[PDB]
Amino acid sequence: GLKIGAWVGTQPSESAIKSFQELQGRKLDIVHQFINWSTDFSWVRPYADAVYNNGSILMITWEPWEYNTVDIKNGKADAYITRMAQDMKAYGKEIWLRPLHEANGDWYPWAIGYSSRVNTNETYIAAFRHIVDIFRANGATNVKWVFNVNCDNVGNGTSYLGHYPGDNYVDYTSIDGYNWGTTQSWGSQWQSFDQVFSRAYQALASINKPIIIAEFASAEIGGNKARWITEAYNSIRTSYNKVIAAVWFHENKETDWRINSSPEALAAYREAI
Ligand SMILES: OC[C@H]1CN[C@H](O)[C@@H](O[C@@H]2O[C@H](CO)[C@@H](O)[C@H](O)[C@H]2O)[C@@H]1O
């Protein structure tokens, strides 16, 4: 069965996880959290314990604001990486780790499309492989590696697979994508789940790895979010057969992505999962 996940809009304490399960009316199979590259495992541990105590898998998006691909490739973050690997091995439990995500965009300082041009496919791949090498050298085979793309290539030099580090370094591929509706002054439009995800999925479906929808959500404005949710999950089950997990992004942020942005959205979400 499709694994159901979320970023719940806050750090996943025991009570945040339980509250989201009451909200969506179902267990969370996967709990998503975001951390940077100046956060040690000791800070993660009480969250990880809440996730595992609930019978869920923790997925961490591990964001190197503090080191770009050149820094990482060159070994300048290795002390930090090594401690994380040691600590995660000692912890022992199955963790899905998603480092250097959305690198086919232009908004992160490790991304290929980032305006300084410092990150290339070569430096990205070398960085990703270097991280995985350190984890394996430290015995952290409990850590599963998640490659990621944004649904669209944004910025110069970006592509779905140019930065792919190889099947020997990846356990899961993944896609992030949003229906922005008409909410953005950059001229956004309502897009169905297919309109958002199909192109990236076709590219990743060429790789013999399972796929996670690591982040998705819909706006309320410009269409019927309840129907979008119903149709999204139908589409995942019907036509995105390599997808093994769907992880909503539940936060009132750029727009109201939450599953409870309206009562009707919530009801549709509860039924869809
Ligand atoms: O633009 C919508 C989302 C696209 N995917 C990004 O990963 C999201 O940004 C992350 O959001 C989390 C949760 O708010 C932050 O902790 C991360 O630092 C951030 O990169 C983005 O909101």
Structural tokens at position 10: 């806050």
Cβ–ligand 1 distance for 34 under 6 Å, the answer: yes
Strand locations in 141-239, DSSP E?
Answer: 143-145, 149-150, 173-179, 211-218
Could you give the strand order of the β-sheet that contains 211-218, starting from the edge strand earlier in sequence?
Answer: 143-145, 95-99, 57-63, 30-36, 3-7, 243-249, 211-218, 173-179, 149-150
Handedness of CA 257, 260, 263, 268 (dihedral sign): positive
Alpha carbon nearest to ligand 1 atom 11, residue: 34
Give residue 153 CA to ligand 1 midpoint distance, Å: 17
Handedness of CA 135, 246, 48, 66 (dihedral sign): positive
Cβ–ligand 1 distance for 254 under 6 Å, the answer: yes
The set of residues, in sequence order, having a beta carbon less than 8 Å from that of 43 and lying 6+ positions away, is: 35
Strand locations in 68-205, DSSP E?
Answer: 95-99, 143-145, 149-150, 173-179
Q: What is the DSSP letter of 252?
A: B
Q: What is the CATH number of the domain that holds 156?
A: 3.20.20.80
* Distances, alpha carbon 250 to alpha carbons 85, 131, 217, 243, 270, in Å: 29, 29, 7, 20, 14
Structure determination technique employed: X-ray
Structural tokens at position 234: 């139908």
Count of residues in the chain: 273
User: Nearest-CA neighbor of 210 among 169, 232, 241, 166?
Assistant: 241
User: Nearest-CA neighbor of 112 among 75, 73, 156?
Assistant: 156
50 in Cβ contact with 17 (< 8 Å): yes
**HSE (CB half, 13 Å, CA atoms) of 245?**
28
The set of residues, in sequence order, having a beta carbon less than 8 Å from that of 198 and lying 6+ positions away, is: none
Distance between CA 210 and CA 48 in Å, rounded?
A: 24
Could you list the active site residues?
102, 215
Total domains in the chain come to 1
Cβ–ligand 1 distance for 29 under 6 Å, the answer: no
Cβ–ligand 1 distance for 148 under 6 Å, the answer: no
Structural tokens at position 143: 């850590």
Distance between CA 210 and CA 146 in Å, rounded?
A: 10
174 in Cβ contact with 148 (< 8 Å): yes
Give the domain extent around 248. 1-273
| Resolution of the model in angstroms | 1.2
Question: Token pair 């727009």 is at which residue?
Answer: 255
Cβ–ligand 1 distance for 253 under 6 Å, the answer: yes
Give residue 176 CA to ligand 1 midpoint distance, Å: 10
Question: Helix H segments across 140-224?
Answer: 193-204
56 in Cβ contact with 17 (< 8 Å): yes
Give residue 61 CA to ligand 1 midpoint distance, Å: 9
Beta bridge partners of 95: 58, 143
Give the helix, strand, coil percentages of the chain, each rounded to 5. Answer: 35, 20, 45
Structural tokens at position 190: 């309502």
71 in Cβ contact with 62 (< 8 Å): no
Q: What is the DSSP letter of 212?
A: E
The set of residues, in sequence order, having a beta carbon less than 8 Å from that of 187 and lying 6+ positions away, is: none
